[PDB]
Design a protein around this ligand. Structure first.
Ligand code: V5C
Lengths: 300, 237
């Protein structure tokens, strides 16, 4: 179990850690989050009490370094930093724990939600989507645009998701125009899986990361990416059986975790109706279809 | 974006453009089988690809053999249309290729866009105009060449005959669309109007009769009357 120490909390803020959240008052004696499970990526995220504009946060993996949060009064945000002096860090944490100044990561033992949401998400792939090589952790916020959004403007602050475009020469083999547009299996399996992602695990990892950025930061380009990656699979007649079964589980836990009151903005009616009721895979996502119909029957 | 009454004069500017109409590509007769079921029999069709400024018509004849052994023919017909239009564009010299292609039915947008990915600078546009190009097969010489075809074939026509020697392309298009709207609303009456007077003939190299300017005014008036009539006969007014 690892710890993320906070130097202080000078401004009132709602702090998220993965799917959990708690309120911290202005100058409250809050010194961080303990008992963070090892083995998963995590995200620690922020929404200031005075400007709910800009949710922002940091993806990290405690196996990769000792990380802490300190507020910057000049840039006006809580920043993640790495402490390279391991003994200074252990001493800081132990003092904070002795004074009981930390919240405990509040995981129920039965509860596999976070594993299920991050099963294929790796820090090394996050760091290629979010490019800032000098840090081991990755900053994301509500406003950051994706590479694809920029082609349709600061490249260093972009989300470099894999570009998916169904009406593109990459997607459509000359001479197979109708075939490839109506059945996207060659784009899924040859172009993307074999060519770009190399395996389905990396594809699912990017899909899961895109959803989490959509949910936690309201990042619109991430929501677009999540739906495009779903639609590319559902619109393929030929998909490995293990991928369909795994996609059904992935989406089930995503839909289960979504706040009920955000379904209007985070769920694209066209994609979901097409995927569940019209597509090649309309009969292959039983768990996802069942939770969608019981939780969001309006969208459909 | 979409082509409508507001941007109508754009059709007659000097940017090359083509209308594409696919409503006569896949044509069938519906009939009973010996067992009392229903079946279709395809007949030859055509893509109607028209330059509204010059009158040049690229009539690609669709022979029934293209449907043999194929499924979902109405869907295939849209993609076959887009394949043939793309092939036409590639066959033209660069300076003759269109800058825009306007499809008369929105279901042609994605098929044509996908087939024209190699031409990112050619705009594919829908229209809100309800153009009567389906009636092209009421023009006897066009119907004749389509029905006689024994293989795929492209035939080039000028759908304005020699009208552009005397009138503008705006006026020629308006005459064409009036003639075709009439033929679509009451083909028998429209054809009676066009051929009632045996002293006005159709030149061998033309599609329409050789009307004088004054006779065209009479003809055009008779077509408006027909369209309005039928509009009454229809709705009872
Ligand atoms: C590099 C890092 N600096 C901190 C600072 C924490 C802090 O405010 N204090 C007062 C440390 C208390 C003692 N000993 C945590 S991790």
């Amino acid at each position: 179990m690892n710890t993320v120490p906070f130097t202080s909390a000078p401004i009132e803020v709602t702090i998220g850690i993965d799917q959990y959240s708690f309120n911290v008052k202005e100058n409250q004696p809050f010194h961080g989050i303990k008992d963070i499970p090892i083995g998963h990526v995590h995200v620690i995220h922020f929404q200031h009490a005075d400007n709910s504009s800009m949710r922002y946060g940091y993806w990290f993996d405690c196996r990769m370094g000792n990380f802490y949060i300190q507020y910057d009064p000049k840039d006006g945000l809580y920043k993640m930093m790495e402490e390279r002096d391991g003994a200074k860090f252990e001493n800081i944490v132990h003092n904070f724990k002795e004074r009981q100044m930390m919240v405990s990561y509040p995981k129920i033992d039965e509860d596999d939600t976070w594993y299920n949401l991050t099963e294929f998400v790796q820090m090394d792939k996050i760091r290629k989507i979010v490019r800032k090589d000098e840090n081991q952790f990755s900053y994301v916020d509500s406003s950051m645009t994706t590479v694809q959004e920029n082609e349709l403007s600061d490249p260093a602050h972009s989300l470099n998701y894999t570009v998916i475009n169904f009406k593109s020469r990459e997607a459509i083999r000359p001479g197979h125009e109708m075939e490839d547009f109506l059945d996207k299996s060659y784009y899924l399996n040859t172009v993307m899986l074999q060519g770009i992602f190399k395996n389905s695990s990396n594809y699912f990892g990017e899909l899961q990361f895109a959803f989490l950025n959509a949910m936690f930061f309201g990042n619109y380009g991430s929501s677009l990416q999540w739906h495009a990656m779903i639609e590319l699979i559902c619109s393929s007649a030929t998909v490995p059986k293990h991928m369909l079964d795994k996609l059904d589980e992935i989406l089930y836990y995503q839909i289960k975790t979504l706040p009920e009151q955000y379904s209007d903005i985070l769920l694209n009616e066209r994609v979901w109706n097409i995927c569940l009721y019209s597509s090649f895979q309309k009969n292959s996502l039983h768990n996802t279809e069942k939770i969608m119909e019981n939780k969001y029957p309006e969208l459909l | 974006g979409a082509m409508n009454s507001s941007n109508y004069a754009e059709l007659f500017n000097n940017d090359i453009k083509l209308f594409v109409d696919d409503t006569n590509v896949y044509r069938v007769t519906v009939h009973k089988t010996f067992e009392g079921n229903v079946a279709t029999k395809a007949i030859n069709g055509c893509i109607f690809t028209l330059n509204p400024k010059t009158g040049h018509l690229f009539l690609k004849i669709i022979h029934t053999s293209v449907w043999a052994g194929q499924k979902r023919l109405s869907q295939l017909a849209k993609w076959k249309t887009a394949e043939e239009v793309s092939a036409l564009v590639r066959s033209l010299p660069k300076e003759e290729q269109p800058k825009q292609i306007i499809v008369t039915r929105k279901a042609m947008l994605d098929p044509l866009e996908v087939h024209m990915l190699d031409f990112p600078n050619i705009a594919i546009r829908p229209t809100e105009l309800r153009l009567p190009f389906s009636a092209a097969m009421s023009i006897d010489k066009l119907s004749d060449v389509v029905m006689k075809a024994t293989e795929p074939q492209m035939v080039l026509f000028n759908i304005y005959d020699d009208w552009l020697d005397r009138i503008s392309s705006y006026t020629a298009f308006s005459r064409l669309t009036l003639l075709l709207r009439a033929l679509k609303t009451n083909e028998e009456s429209a054809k009676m109007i066009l051929l009632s007077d045996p002293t006005i003939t159709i030149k061998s190299y033309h599609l329409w009769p050789s009307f004088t300017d004054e006779q065209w005014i009479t003809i055009e008036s008779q077509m408006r009357d027909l369209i309005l009539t039928e509009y009454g006969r229809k709705y009872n007014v």
